[PDB]
Amino acid sequence: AGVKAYELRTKSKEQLASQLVDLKKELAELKVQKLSRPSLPKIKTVRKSIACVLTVINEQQREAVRQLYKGKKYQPKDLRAKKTRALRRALTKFEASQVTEKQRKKQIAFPQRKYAIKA
Amino acid sequence: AISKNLPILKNHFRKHWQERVKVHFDQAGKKVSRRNARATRAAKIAPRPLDLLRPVVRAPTVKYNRKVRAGRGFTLAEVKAAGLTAAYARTIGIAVDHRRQNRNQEIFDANVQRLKEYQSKIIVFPRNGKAPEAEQVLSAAATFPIAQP
Amino acid sequence: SEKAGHQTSAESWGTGRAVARIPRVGGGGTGRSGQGAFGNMCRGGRMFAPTKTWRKWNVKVNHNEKRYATASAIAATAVASLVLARGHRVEKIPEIPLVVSTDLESIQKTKEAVAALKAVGAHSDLLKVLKSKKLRAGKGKYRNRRWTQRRGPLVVYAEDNGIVKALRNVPGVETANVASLNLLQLAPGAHLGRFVIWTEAAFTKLD
Amino acid sequence: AKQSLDVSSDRRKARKAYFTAPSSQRRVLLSAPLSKELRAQYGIKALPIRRDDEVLVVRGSKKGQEGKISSVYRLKFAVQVDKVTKEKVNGASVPINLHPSKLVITKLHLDKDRKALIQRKGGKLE
Amino acid sequence: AAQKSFRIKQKMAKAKKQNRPLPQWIRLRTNNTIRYNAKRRNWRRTKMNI
RNA sequence: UUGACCUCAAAUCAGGUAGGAGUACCCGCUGAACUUAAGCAUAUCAAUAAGCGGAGGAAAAGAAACCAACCGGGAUUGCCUUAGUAACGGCGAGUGAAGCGGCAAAAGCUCAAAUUUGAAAUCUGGUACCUUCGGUGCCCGAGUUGUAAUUUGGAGAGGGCAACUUUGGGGCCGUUCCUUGUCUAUGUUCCUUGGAACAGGACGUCAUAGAGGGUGAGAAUCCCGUGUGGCGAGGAGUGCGGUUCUUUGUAAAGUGCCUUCGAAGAGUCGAGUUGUUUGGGAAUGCAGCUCUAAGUGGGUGGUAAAUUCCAUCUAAAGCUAAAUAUUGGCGAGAGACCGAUAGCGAACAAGUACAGUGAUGGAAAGAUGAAAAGAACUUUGAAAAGAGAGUGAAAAAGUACGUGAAAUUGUUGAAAGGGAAGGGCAUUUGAUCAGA
RNA sequence: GUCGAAUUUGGGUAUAGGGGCGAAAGACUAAUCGAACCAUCUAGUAGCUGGUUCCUGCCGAAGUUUCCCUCAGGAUAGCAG
RNA sequence: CGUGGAGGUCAGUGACGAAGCCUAGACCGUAAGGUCGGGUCGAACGGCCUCUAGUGCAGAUCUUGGUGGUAGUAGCAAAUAUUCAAAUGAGAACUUUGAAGACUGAAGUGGGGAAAGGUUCCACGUCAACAGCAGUUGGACGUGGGUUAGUCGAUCCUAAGAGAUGGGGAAGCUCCGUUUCAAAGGCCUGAUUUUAUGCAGGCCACCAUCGAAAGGGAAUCCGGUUAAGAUUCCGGAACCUGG
RNA sequence: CUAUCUAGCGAAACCACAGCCAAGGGAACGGGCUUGGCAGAAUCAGCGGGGAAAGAAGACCCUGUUGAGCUUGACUCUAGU
RNA sequence: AAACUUUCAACAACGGAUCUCUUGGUUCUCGCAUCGAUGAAGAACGCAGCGAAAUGCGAUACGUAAUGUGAAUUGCAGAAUUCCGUGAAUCAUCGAAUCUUUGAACGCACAUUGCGCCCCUUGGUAUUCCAGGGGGCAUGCCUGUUUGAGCGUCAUUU
Ligand SMILES: [K+]
Ligand SMILES: [K+]
Ligand SMILES: [Mg+2]
Ligand SMILES: [Mg+2]
Ligand SMILES: [Mg+2]
Ligand SMILES: [Mg+2]
Ligand SMILES: [Mg+2]
Ligand SMILES: [Mg+2]
Ligand SMILES: [Mg+2]
Ligand SMILES: [Mg+2]
Ligand SMILES: [Mg+2]
Ligand SMILES: [Mg+2]
Ligand SMILES: [Mg+2]
Ligand SMILES: [Mg+2]
Ligand SMILES: [Mg+2]
Ligand SMILES: [Mg+2]
Ligand SMILES: [Mg+2]
Ligand SMILES: [Mg+2]
Ligand SMILES: [Mg+2]
Ligand SMILES: [Mg+2]
Ligand SMILES: [Mg+2]
Ligand SMILES: [Mg+2]
Ligand SMILES: [Mg+2]
Ligand SMILES: [Mg+2]
Ligand SMILES: [Mg+2]
Ligand SMILES: [Mg+2]
Ligand SMILES: [Mg+2]
Ligand SMILES: [Mg+2]
Ligand SMILES: [Mg+2]
Ligand SMILES: [Mg+2]
Ligand SMILES: [Mg+2]
Ligand SMILES: [Mg+2]
Ligand SMILES: [Mg+2]
Ligand SMILES: [Mg+2]
Ligand SMILES: [Mg+2]
Ligand SMILES: [Mg+2]
Ligand SMILES: [Mg+2]
Ligand SMILES: [Mg+2]
Ligand SMILES: [Mg+2]
Ligand SMILES: [Mg+2]
Ligand SMILES: [Mg+2]
Ligand SMILES: [Mg+2]
Ligand SMILES: [Mg+2]
Ligand SMILES: [Mg+2]
Ligand SMILES: [Mg+2]
Ligand SMILES: [Mg+2]
Ligand SMILES: [Mg+2]
Ligand SMILES: [Mg+2]
Ligand SMILES: [Mg+2]
Ligand SMILES: [Mg+2]
Ligand SMILES: [Mg+2]
Ligand SMILES: [Mg+2]
Ligand SMILES: [Mg+2]
Ligand SMILES: [Mg+2]
Ligand SMILES: [Mg+2]
Ligand SMILES: [Mg+2]
Ligand SMILES: [Mg+2]
Ligand SMILES: [Mg+2]
Ligand SMILES: [Mg+2]
Ligand SMILES: [Mg+2]
Ligand SMILES: [Mg+2]
Ligand SMILES: [Mg+2]
Ligand SMILES: [Mg+2]
Ligand SMILES: [Mg+2]
Ligand SMILES: [Mg+2]
Ligand SMILES: [Mg+2]
Ligand SMILES: [Mg+2]
Ligand SMILES: [Mg+2]
Ligand SMILES: [Mg+2]
Ligand SMILES: [Mg+2]
Ligand SMILES: [Mg+2]
Ligand SMILES: [Mg+2]
Ligand SMILES: [Mg+2]
């Protein structure tokens, strides 16, 4: 029924590479068989297993690189958050919350008060 | 095209006027939206009457100087005579207008009087106290109506 | 659509080609080429005098004239002959106008609201509804107007203490605050004599 | 009699939503009422039909016939019941498409998820 | 021209692969408003225009 | 000989940014003509179409070098008015604002010009660590040709006197909002018709649910939903209510009096001229060229100029939410709209097929049946098909498929007919038929 | 007619619309030329031509006056409802 | 009078048959029209009081679609020309084979190519449509197969010319200009070899790029082979470039 | 070689309705109307008298307060100089 | 008298009107603000057991990963029914990836699937040649870094 990503995540990158090689060999033999046998659908399962193995390999490699770049500024661009271009160009929360000393003093001295009418 | 005895008409429709025709189908929708916005603004701000206290003011243009109406904001002189600073009045919901000047003692006295009434009829919540809910009234203008002398 | 029928570069062929001088789609190779365009008489052309949104839709009525009409409809609700002539099967009914106890305003359940209406004699009108329901004739039936039915009693109250919700599921039955009486409900189809069931509080607040 | 502004009474929108409903929504659309005995036993009225449910046809030409669902043909908005079939002239048998609203479930195919669904809907005894 | 650019040969290959009638198992699908291949092209009737 | 500085370079130097798309609405530039004037050139169309540059969720404008002339109003924007008015115009055709007033929404502000001079107190970057929209330490560098604090005209600053009053940022739980999930009522009771009951009748039930849709015909009660509530899940933020350590700080801010001051924007205002534009008319704005200010000054005060006053603001620097717009995008709810020659060109593999070198042009085309149950089998024929048989409620539904008009056509039946036919009045004859 | 040089011709290339190109015909410029084609302004304007969709009832004309850059039009008076 | 839609009403009509359609059948109205019977048909529709309009067709060389008379008519007559038998086939003037008679007559009706086309090439099956007769045949229909290169071309060069950069113009889309008012560069190597490197001995540039399948140009021939590929495959025999 | 006839195949132009004349009158040259002459199915090949035959909203002429190409000390401008 | 012509009716044709349908259009209102050098819009070419298109996707190709639901998909074939389960599905959701050749398009070019340069690595003795794999080389501008030029210019040595 194909490979499972949660089973592949328990394996090392060497085991994943060897499983990918075996899956490629199996797919090659299956497409050789497809020339004679009509309507052979196992090649779809083998293709999806290859895709899953490659996905898990890429996941492990990218997690290792994320750990290598943890905490430090200038992460790789494909590892940075993909918001929109305008959102990534927008001022951070620290900026546009920056205020001058005069403005901070006056907004501390005279904040918007809470007041109710009672008549 | 000058036919029988009719008044001379001046219908200015020789431009592409059909490209700019605003039919206010959204009159009722915009009224509902304005009422909704007023409700959310009242809920968002603390108990507070949805508008600032406005001064009494004489209209220019003798066609209208016989009547009195709400102005933009109290003058600095009126605020000082009422015992407040402009910044504090702006933070306790009094509109302040640095442009207007006082040359009429009647209007100045009326504005100082309504400022004092507003101060005696509002409760300013402490910054770091308890201040139990004070039953927000929505209209300072309705609470302090403008009276024609 | 303001561009409907005019999304073409069609031009008149002019005279000398034994065809009408209507503008014709140019080009070739598709069948649309050479066809008439831009004419109200042309297939796929623009309709004559295309409908415009700035048509007058709402009609201004003098407020006093509107109140005159509402007062006339209210008065017509008291005339049993008009109520009978407007459908409104009030034959084995007590005096018109029909005033019921203010307890009706506090009814919360549709079951007891219907029971009270039947007790006060609106059962024949309630049965006229739920039996007059018929599929609407014509294209309106697939324009969110699929079904038509007769109008039942208009229950008028002074304070809504649940009667509106208790009666809103009863077919044909309408509820109205006495402070705001609707002419469209008091004289449906411009026909005087709506069968109105007043509560005591609404009847006293009419003055 | 609808009150919320999020639901539409538009017949065109309702028909489009029904006819373009995905498979997961068609599972709900293809619910069937429980029989009287199962309604008494579980305390719920209707359930989405499942492939191994046992049903009794209560409407149509096949009224009174019983059997086990063979497939929930969600694409056709119909279910196929075993031994409820049409015999073609050539001797073959083809399943009769039935709508679950015209059946009653006489025996539920139960598993952990079905039992959890019973309890979530407020049913008793798994 | 028998001396053709690869781009031309690639478009030629795509046209060759899509020059086929409608598959016969289509027209058996549930709704299947499709009756025939309405985009069939022939060299004797309509030119590819590159 | 070395080390600077200034300016200018180079590097696949370290880190970033711009392009393009969309473009309904928005900010500018550029810019017609058809048209109207019953001709036509000014005018009009129109400060529009087309072309070009540039943003956002709105944009722009915006806290007066304003309006006014009043007992004075007081940022901007939008609506109702002003007003088809003042005014412009071969004063022809036409065009055409603004003040006030009512309302919607309301919000205010900050730089330059000041010596911190007893202390560049300011900031980017690199690096290490950390509690990572950032912080701390260190080190280059930027910067005195001026980066911080202090002040923005409403003021305000430097000194002296007197005291009083006020206050800073994060967690936790709720709340607000957004995106979602799930649960929550009542007949498939009987009779008739029907292929099918969802029809009619009888008896019932729920209704804060009788909106809508589906199911073999008009279904509240068969199903999904609907109505009313309940229970969750993931996020945005602190809008705001408790919770507790952070307690900032002999720091910051406000207030009165006396005194000395009070810096406030230049090829800019303004003027001449030219062109364009405006309702702006001895010149409304704009722009080119020439001239070119002042500081009790300058601008405006809708008739050019001189003289004397007065009134009102403070340009040549800057930010700002809402009310406003929205034939684009996304998500919804609707209609006295159209019902396949209609409605978008496109209900369908439609901007598709197809045409053109190209820019571009651009269709036609929906419906068997409840369900294929899509006609097993026999027979004639080479076959297509026919005749049967059969399925189906119906084949007068056979995929050349709901109904199935007319033009036009075949067969049958009837009738008439010497170079038209058709028609009107009247009756004979034949056919047919209502009423009593 | 001409047929060995002002020759014929392929391909590449250049010149684009009030522009090109022309041993010159207003010729050619993709069957388009005394101003190409395409889209938009544009449903351009037309005193001019054609058409302008049910019934019945009642009443019922004018082609004449004056003026017009007017003479195939309009205004005006008259006739009519 | 009639039509589409809307409010009210007749608790109107209807799968025991709505609407529609056909009907030298009947009734009513002067008429617009209305009503009924019969047939067909299958899911909605009508009377009345009002509301509303994209509301009534014979025309517009009207628009779209469909259909006639003409009419089984005009005609299917240029390119010398066909005939006999057999096979196949349901069916042969047209397919195949054989025989005969002819033509293109090497400036071809032959054998290859350039542009263009794009699978039309070839095989098998096969004739509903197309091949203006026919068809068993086909450039048709359906399914498949087929195009093999160091040496043949492209690729490289420059031609007329096109066109960035540096600069200048233009509100701008973009225009000029092609070595120009530019600080426009890497390949040789002593030394560096704390590293054959930057510094630092020492030599050279009035310049991107695109532009030819007929111009220039490194190098391949013969024989055989397929249903369809051949200077490409196979066998043999060479050559050129780079290392 | 057609035309002709046959097998197969099979359009188009045009068409208010259609198609015998004479005279009359009539929009002043009728296929229809009036008065006469007359007049018998269904047709084939030719033919060019007629259908004021067809092909095209006359290109000539005139009108339009409709254009355009071109010219000129028309009016008003304009690049350039 | 037939044939022929014409009129009407029935049935059958032609044709697709009418009627009734409608997952579409059109208009109005409400709510929201989110494309792109972290490579957009658009284009080319490919991808399924059997697909030409539409739709989806990119050599991980009608798709992978994750989450939810809870037993399908369906035209046939195939697989499975443990399906009381980290588990069907052409399901929904969607935060992790892949994302060919392109395209503002970025080594130079492009009517060429043309031609380079640099780094690491692998093979052919191989730093130089050839080839395979991986990663890079556009322009303008800003801040900073480094290396520089100029009697533009200061100080010092002189
Ligand atoms: K001309
Ligand atoms: K709609
Ligand atoms: Mg249309
Ligand atoms: Mg109808
Ligand atoms: Mg770099
Ligand atoms: Mg841009
Ligand atoms: Mg116009
Ligand atoms: Mg004019
Ligand atoms: Mg005119
Ligand atoms: Mg003119
Ligand atoms: Mg524009
Ligand atoms: Mg944006
Ligand atoms: Mg807004
Ligand atoms: Mg702004
Ligand atoms: Mg100011
Ligand atoms: Mg103002
Ligand atoms: Mg007025
Ligand atoms: Mg104007
Ligand atoms: Mg201060
Ligand atoms: Mg329910
Ligand atoms: Mg139904
Ligand atoms: Mg200033
Ligand atoms: Mg201009
Ligand atoms: Mg601004
Ligand atoms: Mg259409
Ligand atoms: Mg049809
Ligand atoms: Mg039938
Ligand atoms: Mg047919
Ligand atoms: Mg039919
Ligand atoms: Mg007929
Ligand atoms: Mg005869
Ligand atoms: Mg001449
Ligand atoms: Mg018109
Ligand atoms: Mg009379
Ligand atoms: Mg005159
Ligand atoms: Mg005339
Ligand atoms: Mg209509
Ligand atoms: Mg009927
Ligand atoms: Mg008839
Ligand atoms: Mg039906
Ligand atoms: Mg009409
Ligand atoms: Mg007609
Ligand atoms: Mg007519
Ligand atoms: Mg016609
Ligand atoms: Mg026609
Ligand atoms: Mg013939
Ligand atoms: Mg001939
Ligand atoms: Mg011949
Ligand atoms: Mg022959
Ligand atoms: Mg032979
Ligand atoms: Mg010869
Ligand atoms: Mg010979
Ligand atoms: Mg062949
Ligand atoms: Mg033939
Ligand atoms: Mg044949
Ligand atoms: Mg073939
Ligand atoms: Mg060669
Ligand atoms: Mg250039
Ligand atoms: Mg080249
Ligand atoms: Mg060569
Ligand atoms: Mg060959
Ligand atoms: Mg060899
Ligand atoms: Mg005669
Ligand atoms: Mg005569
Ligand atoms: Mg005649
Ligand atoms: Mg006669
Ligand atoms: Mg002849
Ligand atoms: Mg003749
Ligand atoms: Mg004419
Ligand atoms: Mg003419
Ligand atoms: Mg005239
Ligand atoms: Mg002219
Ligand atoms: Mg990509």
GROMACS .gro file of N, CA and C in nm, chain B residues 6-39:
model
  102
  125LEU      N    1  -4.268   7.804  -2.363
  125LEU     CA    2  -4.215   7.729  -2.252
  125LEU      C    3  -4.097   7.805  -2.193
  126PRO      N    4  -4.069   7.787  -2.065
  126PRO     CA    5  -3.951   7.852  -2.006
  126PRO      C    6  -3.822   7.800  -2.070
  127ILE      N    7  -3.721   7.887  -2.072
  127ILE     CA    8  -3.591   7.850  -2.125
  127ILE      C    9  -3.522   7.756  -2.027
  128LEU      N   10  -3.484   7.638  -2.074
  128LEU     CA   11  -3.426   7.535  -1.990
  128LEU      C   12  -3.274   7.533  -2.006
  129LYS      N   13  -3.206   7.489  -1.901
  129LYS     CA   14  -3.061   7.490  -1.892
  129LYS      C   15  -3.009   7.356  -1.842
  130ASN      N   16  -3.059   7.247  -1.901
  130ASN     CA   17  -3.021   7.113  -1.860
  130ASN      C   18  -2.880   7.082  -1.909
  131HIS      N   19  -2.784   7.079  -1.816
  131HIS     CA   20  -2.642   7.060  -1.848
  131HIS      C   21  -2.614   6.911  -1.864
  132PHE      N   22  -2.649   6.857  -1.981
  132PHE     CA   23  -2.626   6.716  -2.010
  132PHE      C   24  -2.565   6.698  -2.148
  133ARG      N   25  -2.465   6.780  -2.181
  133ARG     CA   26  -2.396   6.770  -2.308
  133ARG      C   27  -2.260   6.703  -2.297
  134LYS      N   28  -2.219   6.664  -2.177
  134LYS     CA   29  -2.100   6.582  -2.156
  134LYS      C   30  -2.142   6.436  -2.148
  135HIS      N   31  -2.043   6.349  -2.127
  135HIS     CA   32  -2.071   6.207  -2.103
  135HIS      C   33  -2.121   6.190  -1.960
  136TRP      N   34  -2.240   6.245  -1.935
  136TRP     CA   35  -2.294   6.250  -1.800
  136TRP      C   36  -2.336   6.113  -1.749
  137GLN      N   37  -2.369   6.019  -1.839
  137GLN     CA   38  -2.409   5.886  -1.795
  137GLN      C   39  -2.292   5.807  -1.738
  138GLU      N   40  -2.168   5.849  -1.765
  138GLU     CA   41  -2.053   5.784  -1.705
  138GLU      C   42  -2.035   5.821  -1.558
  139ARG      N   43  -2.098   5.930  -1.513
  139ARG     CA   44  -2.096   5.970  -1.373
  139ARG      C   45  -2.240   5.994  -1.329
  140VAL      N   46  -2.307   5.887  -1.286
  140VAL     CA   47  -2.441   5.896  -1.230
  140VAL      C   48  -2.438   5.816  -1.100
  141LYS      N   49  -2.448   5.885  -0.987
  141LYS     CA   50  -2.448   5.821  -0.857
  141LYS      C   51  -2.593   5.805  -0.811
  142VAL      N   52  -2.645   5.683  -0.819
  142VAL     CA   53  -2.775   5.650  -0.764
  142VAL      C   54  -2.752   5.588  -0.627
  143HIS      N   55  -2.807   5.650  -0.523
  143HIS     CA   56  -2.781   5.608  -0.386
  143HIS      C   57  -2.873   5.492  -0.348
  144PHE      N   58  -2.852   5.379  -0.416
  144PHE     CA   59  -2.918   5.256  -0.377
  144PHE      C   60  -2.875   5.212  -0.238
  145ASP      N   61  -2.754   5.251  -0.197
  145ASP     CA   62  -2.698   5.213  -0.069
  145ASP      C   63  -2.734   5.309   0.043
  146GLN      N   64  -2.842   5.386   0.029
  146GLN     CA   65  -2.882   5.476   0.137
  146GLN      C   66  -2.912   5.397   0.264
  147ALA      N   67  -2.996   5.294   0.254
  147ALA     CA   68  -3.033   5.217   0.373
  147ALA      C   69  -2.916   5.133   0.422
  148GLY      N   70  -2.839   5.075   0.330
  148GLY     CA   71  -2.723   4.998   0.370
  148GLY      C   72  -2.619   5.083   0.441
  149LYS      N   73  -2.597   5.205   0.391
  149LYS     CA   74  -2.503   5.296   0.455
  149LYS      C   75  -2.556   5.347   0.589
  150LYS      N   76  -2.688   5.364   0.602
  150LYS     CA   77  -2.744   5.399   0.732
  150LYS      C   78  -2.721   5.287   0.833
  151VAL      N   79  -2.746   5.163   0.791
  151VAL     CA   80  -2.721   5.048   0.878
  151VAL      C   81  -2.573   5.040   0.914
  152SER      N   82  -2.486   5.066   0.817
  152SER     CA   83  -2.342   5.061   0.842
  152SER      C   84  -2.298   5.171   0.937
  153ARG      N   85  -2.355   5.291   0.924
  153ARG     CA   86  -2.322   5.399   1.016
  153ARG      C   87  -2.368   5.367   1.158
  154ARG      N   88  -2.488   5.311   1.172
  154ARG     CA   89  -2.535   5.273   1.305
  154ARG      C   90  -2.449   5.162   1.364
  155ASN      N   91  -2.409   5.065   1.280
  155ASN     CA   92  -2.319   4.960   1.326
  155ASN      C   93  -2.185   5.017   1.370
  156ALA      N   94  -2.130   5.110   1.292
  156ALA     CA   95  -2.001   5.169   1.326
  156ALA      C   96  -2.011   5.248   1.455
  157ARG      N   97  -2.121   5.321   1.475
  157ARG     CA   98  -2.141   5.392   1.601
  157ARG      C   99  -2.148   5.295   1.718
  158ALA      N  100  -2.217   5.182   1.699
  158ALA     CA  101  -2.228   5.084   1.807
  158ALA      C  102  -2.092   5.024   1.842
   0.00000   0.00000   0.00000
